[PDB]
């Protein structure tokens, strides 16, 4: 019947274990659904420190403009944007948009060697009120999601909140906030997650995630027909280690949050 | 014929008409389903337009920077970036990158204008050696999608061919190649249709397009991991006039035609 009936019947029909959290900014109310458990972050973590390279620029201007190298042993797992650049430079503005809009793993590396390591990423976390979000490895390893692992994890109520206040509230300068909302709006990943349980005319800014057990996510900032701006948190992860990518759940997931 | 075969198959499932053409450029060979039938491109013709107005500057050499304005009275029925810009303008660049990777209408609407009509777009495509094309409308009728109707149709086989010759050839010069390869790589909307069906280390580049007649549309330009570059069309159209869209046909199509 209700909604929170259509997340459970859609949870135990999935295989695995869901986690949402929308935030709905006409009225500050919320839909929630295992929102204070932890789930493997995977790639939407990419957000966090975009976010920590954009605050550091407040007070370093030329920050985005700076090059950075590339190198060979450098790569990972999926750097569709950086191997380009191997033996070369891209800058912290190219990395920010390759880690985000491209979700390279290299991209993000280099984001996190910029703000100190993993703790620079939580410590930026911190800054802004989140107490619940850790980054605590580089990629690819931060993806292996094993149940029960707190390593690299965040609640979807966290993530929500963290969200809004770095897309719509005062967490970063408004220069600042508008450029992470292009990055997110640009975002090539999504359109099968979130975006695809909406209608046609919503328009969406997102970060994707999938890692291992099946670990499926995505954060998004929605901006509805006519309607305040949302924001949205599905995650989901599975119970074998190998198990296949279900974005159609998170589909699924936010055309029951936003039926009604 | 196995890929015959499942082709056929999901095509029976679905219950519409599929369309596909796949172009391997490691050897020119081909995966034909449908591929001389005509189907409505809806907005995979902004690929087209797109590229007539990169032709254009290739002897206009400020074209793209060009301010074009933006009225209230222009905007139809999705205007995603032209709806932030009205009661000012915006450059032919932006219109173009507006057109491919946030599917806006209206920007579309100025490219169809700058080229003096739909009949511009359709002169451009026999310039570089597609007999097949043609635009006969602006946005939103030309997505109407009547079956047995040729306005705003084209074959798969043709628009492989084209896809290839403006993205790989040299249907443009070079910089404007380029230009239009970034482009398809920096879509938003297409995750959920060709890219579905490939694996997830291969980088794609792809217009999408979705009209009357539950039509669902994709053309890419596809770098496989390891391997030469693919051409792939995937066409869909069905019975009903309000059928729903479905992105996941397509994304069956792709898996098809690459899994060899």
Known sequence: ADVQQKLA?????????????????????????????????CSTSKVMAAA?????????????????????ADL??????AEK???????????????????DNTAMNKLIAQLGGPGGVTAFAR??????????????????????????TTTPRAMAQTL????????????????????????????????????ASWVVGDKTGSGGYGTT???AVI???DRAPLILVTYFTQPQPKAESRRDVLASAAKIVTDG
Do not use: C
């Open 85 to 103: 650049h191997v033996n070369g430079t891209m800058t912290l503005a190219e990395l920010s948009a390759a880690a985000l809009q491209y979700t």
């Open 9 to 41: 019947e859609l949870e135990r029909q999935s295989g695995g274990r869901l986690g949402v959290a929308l935030i709905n900014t006409a009225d500050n109310s919320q839909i929630l659904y295992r929102a204070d458990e932890r789930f493997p972050m």
């Open 164 to 199: 809004r206040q770095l897309t719509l509230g005062h967490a970063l300068g408004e220069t600042q906030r508008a450029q992470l909302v292009t990055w997110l709006k640009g975002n090539t990943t999504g359109a099968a997650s979130i975006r695809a349980g909406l209608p």
């Open 127 to 152: 800054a802004i009120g989140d107490e619940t979000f850790r980054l605590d490895r580089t990629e690819p390893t931060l993806n292996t999601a094993i149940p029960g692992d707190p390593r690299d």
């Open 223 to 225: 901006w509805p027909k």
């Open 76 to 81: 990972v797992n999926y750097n569709p944007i």
């Open 217 to 219: 996510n995505d954060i």
């Open 52 to 72: 920590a390279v954009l605050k550091q620029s407040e007070t370093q201007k030329q920050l985005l403009n700076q090059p950075v190298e590339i190198k060979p």
